[PDB]
Amino acid sequence: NKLTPSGDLISSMRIVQGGHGTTIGLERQSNGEMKIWLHHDGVAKLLQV
Amino acid sequence: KDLIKDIDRFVNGFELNELEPKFVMGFGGIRNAVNQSINIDKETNHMYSTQSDSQKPEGFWINKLTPSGDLISSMRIVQGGHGTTIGLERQSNGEMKIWLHHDGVAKLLQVAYKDNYVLDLEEAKGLTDYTPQSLLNKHTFTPLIDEANDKLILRFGDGTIQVRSRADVKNHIDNVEKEMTIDNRWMQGIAVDGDDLYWLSGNSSVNSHVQIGKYSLTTGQKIYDYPFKLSYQDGINFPRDNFKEPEGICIYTNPKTKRKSLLLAMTNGGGGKRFHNLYGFFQLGEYEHFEALRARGSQNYKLTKDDGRALSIPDHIDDLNDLTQAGFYYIDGGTAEKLKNMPMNGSKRIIDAGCFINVYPTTQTLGTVQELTRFSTGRKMVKMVRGMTLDVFTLKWDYGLWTTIKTDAPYQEYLEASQYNNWIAYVTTAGEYYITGNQMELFRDAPEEIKKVGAWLRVSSGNAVGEVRQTLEANISEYKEFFSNVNAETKHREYGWVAKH
Amino acid sequence: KDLIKDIDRFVNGFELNELEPKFVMGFGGIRNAVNQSINIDKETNHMYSTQSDSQKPEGFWINKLTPSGDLISSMRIVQGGHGTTIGLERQSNGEMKIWLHHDGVAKLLQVAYKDNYVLDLEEAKGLTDYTPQSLLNKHTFTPLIDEANDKLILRFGDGTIQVRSRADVKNHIDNVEKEMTIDNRWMQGIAVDGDDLYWLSGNSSVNSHVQIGKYSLTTGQKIYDYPFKLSYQDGINFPRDNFKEPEGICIYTNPKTKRKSLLLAMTNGGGGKRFHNLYGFFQLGEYEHFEALRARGSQNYKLTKDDGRALSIPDHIDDLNDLTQAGFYYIDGGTAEKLKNMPMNGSKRIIDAGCFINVYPTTQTLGTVQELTRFSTGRKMVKMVRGMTLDVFTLKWDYGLWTTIKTDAPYQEYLEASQYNNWIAYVTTAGEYYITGNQMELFRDAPEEIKKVGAWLRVSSGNAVGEVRQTLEANISEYKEFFSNVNAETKHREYGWVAKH
Amino acid sequence: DLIKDIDRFVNGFELNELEPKFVMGFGGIRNAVNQSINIDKETNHMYSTQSDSQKPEGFWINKLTPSGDLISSMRIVQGGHGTTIGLERQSNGEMKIWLHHDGVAKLLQVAYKDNYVLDLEEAKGLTDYTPQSLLNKHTFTPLIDEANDKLILRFGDGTIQVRSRADVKNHIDNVEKEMTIDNRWMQGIAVDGDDLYWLSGNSSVNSHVQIGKYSLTTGQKIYDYPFKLSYQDGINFPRDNFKEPEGICIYTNPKTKRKSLLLAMTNGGGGKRFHNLYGFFQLGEYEHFEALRARGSQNYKLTKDDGRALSIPDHIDDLNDLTQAGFYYIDGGTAEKLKNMPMNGSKRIIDAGCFINVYPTTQTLGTVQELTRFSTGRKMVKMVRGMTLDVFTLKWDYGLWTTIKTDAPYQEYLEASQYNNWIAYVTTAGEYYITGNQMELFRDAPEEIKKVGAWLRVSSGNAVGEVRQTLEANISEYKEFFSNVNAETKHREYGWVAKH
Amino acid sequence: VNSHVQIGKYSLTTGQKIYDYPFKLSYQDGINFPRDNFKEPEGICIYTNP
Known part of the structure; x- marks a missing residue:
């Protein structure tokens, strides 16, 4: 879930069969796009989506 | 001392104002x-x-x-x-x-x-x-x-x-x-x-x-x-x-x-x-790096002469069947008159003038198409194509029949009876022609009803048995039209002209 | 000592792992x-x-x-x-x-x-x-x-x-x-x-x-x-x-x-x-040996822009008669509207959109053909060709009449009466057109019998006296067809419409 | 001596020590x-x-x-x-x-x-x-x-x-x-x-x-x-x-x-x-004239280097995606599978190998695809369509197909089964032939000539997207019929109308 | 949104600029994400707590 600084929902992204999503890592790119470090349990890979 | 300082400058120097600008390539x-x-x-x-x-x-x-x-x-x-x-x-x-x-x-x-x-x-x-x-x-x-x-x-x-x-x-x-x-x-x-x-x-x-x-x-x-x-x-x-x-x-x-x-x-x-257009200033030998890159993307097979003239056929080619190499060619009227295996309508050579010959860039097995364009300025331009394939085991060629691309101009495609041995049946190539009154009298198989008047001749595509239907539309102020089937190869007429009016 | 051992290596060395691979040419x-x-x-x-x-x-x-x-x-x-x-x-x-x-x-x-x-x-x-x-x-x-x-x-x-x-x-x-x-x-x-x-x-x-x-x-x-x-x-x-x-x-x-x-x-x-594709590793200066061999067999006259775009006509060309140089060109609709000596059907410019212009690789005496292709996506594409020759003594050009290559699409070639000064007789270029009922009423020389209904217009090739036969086939559930001859140049109608039904 | 060799090679201009090289042709x-x-x-x-x-x-x-x-x-x-x-x-x-x-x-x-x-x-x-x-x-x-x-x-x-x-x-x-x-x-x-x-x-x-x-x-x-x-x-x-x-x-x-x-x-x-111009050059001077030749040369590849037509890339499975200029050829197998090939209803018109001429483009990358069916026993079909690129959306718009009229002394044979036994499927302009055997199998054949052959002629469209089909009986007496068909839906407007 | 907000600090005794201070504000959806992409500066004032 992407949220405003006041907690309102902007948008959401579903990782189908990605696992529990216990923790993730944020890495904002230079062009302003956000990449998410997450472990996709379905494909058994550490991803930067 | 100095001769080396000159060679090293020329070979290893990269001083801009001593280098010549050279065209490299265009880009999009x-x-x-x-x-x-x-x-x-x-x-x-x-x-x-x-x-x-x-x-x-x-x-x-x-x-x-x-x-x-x-x-x-x-x-x-x-x-x-x-x-x-x-x-x-x-x-x-x-x-x-x-x-x-x-x-x-x-x-x-x-x-x-x-x-x-x-x-x-x-x-x-x-x-x-x-x-x-x-x-x-x-x-x-x-x-x-x-x-x-x-x-x-x-x-x-x-x-x-x-x-x-x-x-x-x-x-x-x-x-x-x-x-x-x-x-x-x-x-x-x-x-x-x-x-x-x-x-x-x-x-x-x-x-x-x-x-x-x-x-x-x-x-x-x-x-x-x-x-x-x-x-x-x-x-x-x-x-x-x-x-x-x-x-x-x-x-x-x-x-x-x-x-x-x-x-x-x-x-x-x-x-x-x-x-x-890309230009460049280069150390000795570095222009070749980009020339090779240009060459890889360039047209490296000659389609025309270097000045924009069409290719000429080799002197040893006296037969259209042998012009199987891709390229854009032109032959003058004299050559068109003598080349073997040119398109015919019976005894008449269809291409009765100079002719552009476009030999298509070939298939992966060297099959190609010959597209002929009769070059005239006072008559319509005729366009015809045929295909051919090469047997890689016998190295012999198989040549297909001629297709006519329909063309028309505000001037007539005039039929001189003598050039067809006075047989309308000789004209089995699809298209529209004109027969003047004078020539209709000279054609042996003209319809009697319009023996002394002109008419447009229209020739259809073939049917299953190799026959084509000829249609004559009288060039008069009243409706008179006839048709009759002719075998394209033997020029044999199946039946007399049938009136539609 | 060392500067010479560097120059000699670069100039006279042939150590493979020190040489750059460069594309040379393709081969068959x-x-x-x-x-x-x-x-x-x-x-x-x-x-x-x-x-x-x-x-x-x-x-x-x-x-x-x-x-x-x-x-x-x-x-x-x-x-x-x-x-x-x-x-x-x-x-x-x-x-x-x-x-x-x-x-x-x-x-x-x-x-x-x-x-x-x-x-x-x-x-x-x-x-x-x-x-x-x-x-x-x-x-x-x-x-x-x-x-x-x-x-x-x-x-x-x-x-x-x-x-x-x-x-x-x-x-x-x-x-x-x-x-x-x-x-x-x-x-x-x-x-x-x-x-x-x-x-x-x-x-x-x-x-x-x-x-x-x-x-x-x-x-x-x-x-x-x-x-x-x-x-x-x-x-x-x-x-x-x-x-x-x-x-x-x-x-x-x-x-x-x-x-x-x-x-x-x-x-x-x-x-x-x-x-x-042939690549090579070369001593200094040896790539040129094979580049010259490639160049001899390459296309050394520019037919298109270096990125695959068609050529553009020079700004100084305001007349199709002056575009006699071989190449594949394109002109946009604006240029097609203004160029002199474009194909006409009376007052109507036939090419009423952008147009590809293929100027053929020339004859040995610089004769050529201009092949026009009207570029549209919502209408059929019209193709027309004409030839021209250069008098080597007067350096003047002679331009031939236009040939139309027959083309058709599942959409109409629509005739707006006003664009032809309300004269069907203006349409003397061979081909098939369509006249809606609304436009038939506006054409002055429409047949009265079908004055208020649509019809296909078919225009034949010329006869011996420069006339062409127009045919109108009514777009109705009963057989109604008319014909009438028109002089291609002056647009003068020889006689009223003659019914076939 | 090593310097007297390098200087000769680099700075020498002794004619009989130089190699002649082709430079360019000229008119x-x-x-x-x-x-x-x-x-x-x-x-x-x-x-x-x-x-x-x-x-x-x-x-x-x-x-x-x-x-x-x-x-x-x-x-x-x-x-x-x-x-x-x-x-x-x-x-x-x-x-x-x-x-x-x-x-x-x-x-x-x-x-x-x-x-x-x-x-x-x-x-x-x-x-x-x-x-x-x-x-x-x-x-x-x-x-x-x-x-x-x-x-x-x-x-x-x-x-x-x-x-x-x-x-x-x-x-x-x-x-x-x-x-x-x-x-x-x-x-x-x-x-x-x-x-x-x-x-x-x-x-x-x-x-x-x-x-x-x-x-x-x-x-x-x-x-x-x-x-x-x-x-x-x-x-x-x-x-x-x-x-x-x-x-x-x-x-x-x-x-x-x-x-x-x-x-x-x-x-x-x-x-x-x-x-043809040849030359003898000091080291590095050939490049001066090569650049001059290159400026006037064809620097975009229209055919393979040996005169073969270009082949379409393996990743192209749709004619709509072949928008790059060049002269191509596809064999019969590829023509059978490519998406967006010309159709006459259920029938693929190009039922053989095909040359595809993609025109050198307009200044805004618009182009024309000209198809030529490659056969030796049948007539060659030629069809063209245009397409344009929206520079804001980067999407393509594809136009309708134009048919260039072609004919040969052999028939353009219509097999009823390939058109689901509907003559109405044939809405592409041109002349075809229907044998007597196939006329019997076509559902919408005119009864009067149900058992005999005829030429089928298909006109250009009218204002409402309809085309007129004409059947001329291949017999010794005058029999001709016509009927309008909607080019897209193949719906027949009315039964065959006799002219005789 | 592409124009940064800035306050320049000057000294009335020296008469010259001390420094320019550009800064980003957090709007409806965060830093430099204002509603309808409009963020115009409209005045300042100093407040001294009595």
């Missing part, structure tokens, strides 16, 4: 507009250019090009500004990132290049800002890269040049390593190679000379100005439509030979007809 | 299959390649090629084996002999090359055997030649290299002068230059690097392995269809300059689409 | 052999001469682009053979030509004019620059040594007169140097300072091309240099076995000051002559 771009910048990706030989998008708040396109200048894809930076310069940084996974200043969001960006992609304003706002801390609220610059030293250089409108470390900017480190000032005629391009800075200037007029100024980043002062003339379409300072605008420069260092070239982009052609 | 072959070997005939500049024939007991083709890679002729060795390598030996009378191992008859042969010839098995049995005495019942080798030293080298499957004198083998003398052993990745080519042996390896995958190993025939051991990347269609390691297979190497020694090149054959393109 | 207004060749160093223009083939011989002067294309020509009516000429570009950019006008027996300095005929009456009023000592002795032609501003006169008997060009322009008669040159006759001459070059050889394949090098100070021959050139099919394999030498010139690069000796050859048979 998605926009029908002038070019703006040019850069080489040394790890792929790809080229990248920028062009304006010509919109209310200016944006620019980034064009990804083949090493021979063909367009691979383009990326639009909506409201990104002029795109005067950009910086290439290829990542480890093979993806390309572009250093550019997005004027719309007032941020220095490092954007991932995407093929045929539109970077709209809402996405650009969410991208990471790499603008140095000391340069906020001061967004009048564009970036470029010095590949050899991994420097990210910033060019400012007022003429300030800031040399920074690319890695520093990527790590949000604000450190100006070198700063100098550059100073009718304005900037058209800038390239930095180590200590050497190059400054391109000149406008599009034929009377405005192209010039590159060489500066030293350590001294900060100009070394020299280098004016030069380029050879365009019709020679030195004779560009198409009298338009020759300089559109950016870049330094290239050969990864293998480590020798250098300075490449220069020019736009020629008139309004709405712009096209881009 | 009779088979739609990958290439296998490549060789140069130094006395003619002819090239020779081999290809598999893809048959049950494998045979191979020998292709004789022009210096620019075009196919001259081919010779098939039925059941001759793979044809991995061959050796060229040009005879005194100018005939070429090919050293090859015929696997079908298990003999080393010296066959006379013949153009487009099939060497069947029965003939191969009667040919002279040159297999050395010690190599009978041991036929797992193919031959190659070292031209500079007149050596015939035999490469064995197990990796044995036998260096023999070619003259010795021709004289049935069995003497092994040198023998060494070469040793996932297998052999793709081998070339010998004096003491230096080169070993090409690598598979077709984009992930498999091309590599040449350099060996010394005196030491017998490897000097070094040299991996390298080539620039393909879209750049370094971006070949068409992701296919890049190495297909043989050869050393070339320039007869005049005595300087050397190592040429490398690659096959690119996907299944059933293979094509062959 | 000319006349369908005839070439005669001379010269470079205008200030523009890179080339100038050649050709005979006019007239009763008193005249010659043409051709002005050429740096890539050999014809800009314009000027005819010197009855001017003679035009064996050699001299270029002198003026300050205002106009070109003047030093030539000997044999018709008026005068050495002239004529202003070059584009596509202009210099008739005899005008030539008589032109200024005479013939030296005082050379009147009534008009058996020479002029050439220029650009580097030293010399005007050289070559005489028929073999006399070479070296004069100052400025002197001749000022009507000053002074012979600075004179030497004598001496089966095989003169084909060209070029002077570079002290070096004089003499080209000889005839058109036969058995006649070797040769350049003799002479010294103007010594007056004697230094050496003869025979050489072989590589022609269309290789060394001494010229087209039609014709290879005639047609002039030479020395070129000095204004920037590098290094030299080239250029040689013009004419190849091809009678009435098919074409001209």
Whole structure:
């Protein structure tokens, strides 16, 4: 879930069969796009989506 | 002593004002507009250019090009500004990132290049800002890269040049390593190679000379100005439509030979007809690097003579069946009269004048098509095609039947009875012809009802048994039309003319 | 001391792993299959390649090629084996002999090359055997030649290299002068230059690097392995269809300059689409030898812009009569509206949109054809051609009448009465048009019987007196058709519409 | 010694040590052999001469682009053979030509004019620059040594007169140097300072091309240099076995000051002559002319390098995606599977291999796809459609198919099953044939001719997207029917209407 | 959105600029994400707590 600084929902992204999503890592790119470090349990890979 | 200092200069020197500018290749771009910048990706030989998008708040396109200048894809930076310069940084996974200043969001960006992609304003706002801390609220610059030293250089409108470390900017480190000032005629391009800075200037007029100024980043002062003339379409300072605008420069260092070239982009052609040509200044032997890249993308099989004349058939060709080599040919009337296996309508050679012969670029098994175009100025032009295939086991050819492409002109396709042995049945090639009253009297198989008057002859396509239907429409003020079937090969008439009226 | 040892290395060095690979030219072959070997005939500049024939007991083709890679002729060795390598030996009378191992008859042969010839098995049995005495019942080798030293080298499957004198083998003398052993990745080519042996390896995958190993025939051991990347269609390691297979190497020694090149054959393109590209490693200045050979066979007159865009007409051309220079052009709708001498149907400009203009490669006396193609997406495309000739004494042009190539689409060629001054008689260009009921009412010369209903208009070719017959077929459920002759130039109607029903 | 070897290779310009290399082809207004060749160093223009083939011989002067294309020509009516000429570009950019006008027996300095005929009456009023000592002795032609501003006169008997060009322009008669040159006759001459070059050889394949090098100070021959050139099919394999030498010139690069000796050859048979430029170059100087050739060459690939048509990329499975210009061919298998091929209902019209000509594009990348069905036993079908690219959305818009009318003496056979037994499916304009057997199988066949064959003719569309089908019975009596069909939905508007 | 907000600090005794201070504000959706992409500065004032 992407949220405003006041907690309102902007948008959401579903990782189908990605696992529990216990923790993730944020890495904002230079062009302003956000990449998410997450472990996709379905494909058994550490991803930067 | 001196002979060596002369040879070393000629062999190993790279002093700009001692080098000759040479045309390299043309290159494309998605926009029908002038070019703006040019850069080489040394790890792929790809080229990248920028062009304006010509919109209310200016944006620019980034064009990804083949090493021979063909367009691979383009990326639009909506409201990104002029795109005067950009910086290439290829990542480890093979993806390309572009250093550019997005004027719309007032941020220095490092954007991932995407093929045929539109970077709209809402996405650009969410991208990471790499603008140095000391340069906020001061967004009048564009970036470029010095590949050899991994420097990210910033060019400012007022003429300030800031040399920074690319890695520093990527790590949000604000450190100006070198700063100098550059100073009718304005900037058209800038390239930095180590200590050497190059400054391109000149406008599009034929009377405005192209010039590159060489500066030293350590001294900060100009070394020299280098004016030069380029050879365009019709020679030195004779560009198409009298338009020759300089559109950016870049330094290239050969990864293998480590020798250098300075490449220069020019736009020629008139309004709405712009096209881009790459020139270069080269160390000895380095022009061949780019010539090979051009050659790979060039037409290396001769379709016409080098001056635009069509090919002539070899003297040893006396048979159309033997002209199986691809190319655009022309034969004059004399040759058309004598060549074996030309299209016939019985005893009449259909191509009774000079003839263009287009032999198609062949199939993978050397099959081809011969497309004939009868060259006349007082009669209609006849177009006919036939195919042929080569048996790779017997090395013998199989030739197909002739197809006629329907053509018509406001003048008649006149039928002289004597040329067809006075047989209308000889005319089995599809199309429309005209028989005058005088000639109808001379044709043996003319319909008696219209024996003394003219008529259009129309010949259909074949049926299942190889017959074609001939139709005669009398050229009179009353409706009279006849038809009759004829066997295309033997010219045997199946039945007498059948009246429709 | 050192500056000279650097210049001499750069100018006179021929160390393979210090040289840059450069594209030279493409080349053909009779088979739609990958290439296998490549060789140069130094006395003619002819090239020779081999290809598999893809048959049950494998045979191979020998292709004789022009210096620019075009196919001259081919010779098939039925059941001759793979044809991995061959050796060229040009005879005194100018005939070429090919050293090859015929696997079908298990003999080393010296066959006379013949153009487009099939060497069947029965003939191969009667040919002279040159297999050395010690190599009978041991036929797992193919031959190659070292031209500079007149050596015939035999490469064995197990990796044995036998260096023999070619003259010795021709004289049935069995003497092994040198023998060494070469040793996932297998052999793709081998070339010998004096003491230096080169070993090409690598598979077709984009992930498999091309590599040449350099060996010394005196030491017998490897000097070094040299991996390298080539620039393909879209750049370094971006070949068409992701296919890049190495297909043989050869050393070339320039007869005049005595300087050397190592040429490398690659096959690119996907299944059933293979094509062959020659690369090379060159001493300084030797690339120009092959560039000139490529240029002689290349298209040296510009038919399109360098990026595949059609040519634009010069700004100074405001009259189609002046566009007599060969090339493929495009003009936009605005230009088509203003150009003088465009095709007309009375007051109506036929080409009422953008237009491709194909100016044919000219006759030997600079005659040419202009082929116009109206560029639209919502209407049919009109194609028209006219010819023109140049008087070499007056330098004036004569322009012929327009021929229409018949075209049709499932959409109408709509006639707006006002554009023809409300005269159907204005439409004298051959073809089929449609008149809606609304427009028929507005045409002054419409047939009264169908004044308020639509109809197809068909216009024939001219007759002897410059008249054309117009036909109107009513677009109704009952048969109603009319005809009337019109003079194509003056638009004068000869008589009222004549009913066929 | 290693330096004396490197300097020779890098800075040497000894003719008989240099390799001849093809440079470029070049044109000319006349369908005839070439005669001379010269470079205008200030523009890179080339100038050649050709005979006019007239009763008193005249010659043409051709002005050429740096890539050999014809800009314009000027005819010197009855001017003679035009064996050699001299270029002198003026300050205002106009070109003047030093030539000997044999018709008026005068050495002239004529202003070059584009596509202009210099008739005899005008030539008589032109200024005479013939030296005082050379009147009534008009058996020479002029050439220029650009580097030293010399005007050289070559005489028929073999006399070479070296004069100052400025002197001749000022009507000053002074012979600075004179030497004598001496089966095989003169084909060209070029002077570079002290070096004089003499080209000889005839058109036969058995006649070797040769350049003799002479010294103007010594007056004697230094050496003869025979050489072989590589022609269309290789060394001494010229087209039609014709290879005639047609002039030479020395070129000095204004920037590098290094030299080239250029040689013009004419190849091809009678009435098919074409001209090819060769050269001998100092190290690095070939690139000067290669760049000039490249500027005028076709630098976008239309066919494979051996004359085969392009193949479509493996990743193209949809004709809509083949928007890149070029001449392509696809085999029958590929034509069967490609998406968005022309259809007549359920029937794929292109039911064989197919040439695909993708036009060189508009300035906004619009193009046309022209398909040609490749068969040998059936007629060849030709169809075209256009498409445009939206530069804002980067999406393509594809137009409807136009059919180019084609016909052969064999039928375009209609198998009822391939059209789901509907004649209405055939809405593409053209003429087809339905056999009696197939007419019985078509559901919408006219009953009156249910068991007999007929030609099917399909018209162009009308305003409402309908096309008129016409059936003409293949019998000895007049029977013809028509009926309208909607091209898209294949819906028949009404039953067949008899004309008989 | 591409125009940074800035406050310049000056000294009335010296008469010259001390420094320029550019800064980013957090709007509806965060830093430099204002509603309808409009963010215009409209005055300042100093407040001293009595």
